[PDB]
Amino acid sequence: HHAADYVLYKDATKPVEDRVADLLGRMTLAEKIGQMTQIERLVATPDVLRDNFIGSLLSGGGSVPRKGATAKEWQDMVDGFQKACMSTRLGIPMIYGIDAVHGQNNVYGATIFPHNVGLGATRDPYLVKRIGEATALEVRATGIQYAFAPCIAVCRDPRWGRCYESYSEDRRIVQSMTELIPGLQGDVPKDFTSGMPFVAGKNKVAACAKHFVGDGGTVDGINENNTIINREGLMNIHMPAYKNAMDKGVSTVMISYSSWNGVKMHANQDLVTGYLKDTLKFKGFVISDWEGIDRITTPAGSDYSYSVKASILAGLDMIMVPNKYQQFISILTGHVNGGVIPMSRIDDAVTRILRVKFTMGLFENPYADPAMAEQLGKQEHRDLAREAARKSLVLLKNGKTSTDAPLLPLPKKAPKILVAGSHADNLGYQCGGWTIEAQGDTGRTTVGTTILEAVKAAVDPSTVVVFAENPDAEFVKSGGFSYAIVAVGEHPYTETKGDNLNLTIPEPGLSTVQAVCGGVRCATVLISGRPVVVQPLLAASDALVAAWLPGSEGQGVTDALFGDFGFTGRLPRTWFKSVDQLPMNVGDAHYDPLFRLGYGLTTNAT
Numbered sequence: 001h002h003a004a005d006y007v008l009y010k011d012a013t014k015p016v017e018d019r020v021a022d023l024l025g026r027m028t029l030a031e032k033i034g035q036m037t038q039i040e041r042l043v044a045t046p047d048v049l050r051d052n053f054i055g056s057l058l059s060g061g062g063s064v065p066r067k068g069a070t071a072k073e074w075q076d077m078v079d080g081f082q083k084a085c086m087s088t089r090l091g092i093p094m095i096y097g098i099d100a101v102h103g104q105n106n107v108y109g110a111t112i113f114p115h116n117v118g119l120g121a122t123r124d125p126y127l128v129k130r131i132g133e134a135t136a137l138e139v140r141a142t143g144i145q146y147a148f149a150p151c152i153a154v155c156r157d158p159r160w161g162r163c164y165e166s167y168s169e170d171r172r173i174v175q176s177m178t179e180l181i182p183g184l185q186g187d188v189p190k191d192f193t194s195g196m197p198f199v200a201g202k203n204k205v206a207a208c209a210k211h212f213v214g215d216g217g218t219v220d221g222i223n224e225n226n227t228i229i230n231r232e233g234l235m236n237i238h239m240p241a242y243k244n245a246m247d248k249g250v251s252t253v254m255i256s257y258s259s260w261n262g263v264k265m266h267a268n269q270d271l272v273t274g275y276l277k278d279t280l281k282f283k284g285f286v287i288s289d290w291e292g293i294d295r296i297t298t299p300a301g302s303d304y305s306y307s308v309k310a311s312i313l314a315g316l317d318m319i320m321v322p323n324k325y326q327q328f329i330s331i332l333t334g335h336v337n338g339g340v341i342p343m344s345r346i347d348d349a350v351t352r353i354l355r356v357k358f359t360m361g362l363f364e365n366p367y368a369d370p371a372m373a374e375q376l377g378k379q380e381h382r383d384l385a386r387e388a389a390r391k392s393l394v395l396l397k398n399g400k401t402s403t404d405a406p407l408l409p410l411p412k413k414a415p416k417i418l419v420a421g422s423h424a425d426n427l428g429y430q431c432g433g434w435t436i437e438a439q440g441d442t443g444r445t446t447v448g449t450t451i452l453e454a455v456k457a458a459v460d461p462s463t464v465v466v467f468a469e470n471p472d473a474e475f476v477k478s479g480g481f482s483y484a485i486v487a488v489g490e491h492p493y494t495e496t497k498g499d500n501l502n503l504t505i506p507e508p509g510l511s512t513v514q515a516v517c518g519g520v521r522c523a524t525v526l527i528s529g530r531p532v533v534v535q536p537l538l539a540a541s542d543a544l545v546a547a548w549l550p551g552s553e554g555q556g557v558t559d560a561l562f563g564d565f566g567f568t569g570r571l572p573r574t575w576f577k578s579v580d581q582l583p584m585n586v587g588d589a590h591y592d593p594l595f596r597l598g599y600g601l602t603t604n605a606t
């Protein structure tokens with residue numbers, strides 16, 4: 001279709017499948033295996049990207065051009081890598097991925113939304129869609145086109161260090177929150193075939209349903225472990241939301257480190273090819289987790305030749321190496337050259353990769369848009385996070401006895417109030433994991449409003465606010481306080497570091513609540529990724545709020561404390577009496593919760 005140097009794959013007016021086929025038929029083995037390779041920015045250089053025809057880059061947690069980098073610094077970095085990729089023979093653009101799992105959370109100044117467990121507490125799929133939308137804009141602010149989200153794990157045991165990344169122990173709630181997908185990617189058209197990939201264009205991002213499948217079903221919540229459940233329960237609990245994701249055009253699917261009845265997901269042909277591809281008709285690309293193929297073996301990495309064979313024969317399309325690309329490419333090339341992996345498998349992986357890239361407009365808009373940089377941390381997005389934080393809060397107690405005056409909502413005007421606790425003025429703790437680093441961090445790590453800052457922004461000008469992180473009982477009794485707001489809870493974590501068999505909050509936490517509430521009527525705000533042992537905190541407190549990990553916008557907390565809005569959140573998980581009960585889920589036979597799934601007290605706006 002027209003000039004003498006015409007190349008059909010480069011013609012934006014042509015159908016995606018025709019462009020895919022046209023380009024695939026021109027590629028060498030090296031160019032094909034390159035597409036299948038995703039590398040860390042930390043090992044990327046212009047020569048590495050060209051010489052190995054690399055398909056994809058990522059940032060792992062904390063993998064950033066520098067601390068405090070601006071949106072434009074990110075764009076410049078991503079465009080630098082893209083320029084190298086576009087200078088290859090075929091000029092296939094790379095796709096750049098990142099964990100934007102509660103906003104664009106590796107980036108300084110990005111809006112940080114509540115983590116998924118709190119979003120489950122909202123029962124508000126449209127709010128979740130709007131968070132997807134805003135997160136797409138903040139990702140594209142940084143020049144990035146691909147988010148490793150949503151995590152649609154169904155966490156069945158809160159001892160797991162990633163339980164906060166699950167919207168609920170109830171698969172129906174997780175299913176409902178797959179609205180994140182069309183928020184991130186755009187709505188699919190009226191005619192759409194379930195399982196096809198979709199992204200609307202340059203203001204949206206490719207999504208990723210992860211981690212397939214049963215990541216939240218592991219024994220005793222041990223991260224990356226074995227999920228022991230018959231096929232019926234796998235399909236009834238862990239699988240459903242993947243079909244909702246197919247229906248909404250999720251572009252990619254990431255494979256889990258976990259095993260199912262002793263078989264490593266990253267080696268499971270029956271589930272990855274037989275089920276996801278052949279039965280759900282998924283036509284986007286399947287990506288590994290980070291050194292996920294390595295972890296097929298014990299020790300991990302002890303037979304990388306086998307890792308490559310097993311994973312690629314199982315049906316994985318793109319491998320998150322993410323460092324040893326030379327070894328990955330060499331070993332895979334060897335296997336193809338020896339007939340151990342057929343060309344049909346290579347061509348399928350590359351067809352899927354290219355399909356997503358052409359569908360999302362990456363060949364038309366390979367570079368960043370500098371007018372998008374100002375989307376990062378935009379006040380309108382912060383307003384949305386603030387609404388989400390407030391809606392996520394679950395009020396568990398509001399009065400020690402049925403005849404007490406209800407403590408919440410608290411008055412904005414009082415002569416003197418106390419804000420206390422390790423979590424009252426600590427932005428990093430209120431954001432939790434996957435914020436600036438994977439494990440998260442402590443203190444003022446990004447731009448935001450702590451609980452203390454939000455209190456001061458909310459109260460009448462005549463109200464004196466005193467902060468004391470860990471006051472003793474006498475300080476409180478002597479201070480002339482009208483009431484106290486005390487905030488405590490878990491420290492930031494993710495993955496295996498978060499696995500925890502006792503689920504008791506660190507001290508001083510309870511001891512501060514006791515000292516404060518002992519002296520003055522108190523609202524306790526518990527910051528956690530999951531239910532934790534809570535009877536002792538309840539016994540001391542007039543009121544207590546499960547605030548989960550509400551993110552950067554602390555004013556969401558005070559919005560409900562001071563009665564600007566009423567409490568509406570409902571537990572998205574069972575609150576256990578003891579960890580000896582676990583696992584214990586709604587619908588179980590011996591169900592003896594401290595608070596059942598769906599529990600939540602309400603207030604009315606002042």
Ligand SMILES: *[C@@H]1O[C@H](CO)[C@@H](O)[C@H](O)[C@H]1NC(C)=O
Nearest residue numbers: 222224225226258259262298
């Ligand atoms: C589960 O963890 C146990 C305890 O560390 C470990 O020995 C076992 O190999 C793990 N199993 C799987 C499938 O990952």
Ligand SMILES: *[C@@H]1O[C@H](CO)[C@@H](O)[C@H](O)[C@H]1NC(C)=O
Nearest residue numbers: 497498499500501502503504
């Ligand atoms: C509970 O578990 C974590 C390790 O997972 C540990 O750091 C913490 O000290 C433990 N708490 C108690 C009460 O043993």
Ligand SMILES: *[C@@H]1O[C@H](CO)[C@@H](O)[C@H](O)[C@H]1NC(C)=O
Nearest residue numbers: 398406566601602603604605
């Ligand atoms: C709030 O308003 C409702 C209905 O409009 C009322 O019936 C309810 O009891 C009120 N709730 C509280 C906690 O006062």
Ligand SMILES: OC[C@H]1O[C@@H](O)[C@H](O)[C@@H](O)[C@@H]1O
Nearest residue numbers: 059060061099148210289290
């Ligand atoms: O950061 C890249 C990846 O790291 C892995 O450890 C996690 O399991 C994934 O959820 C994440 O996308």
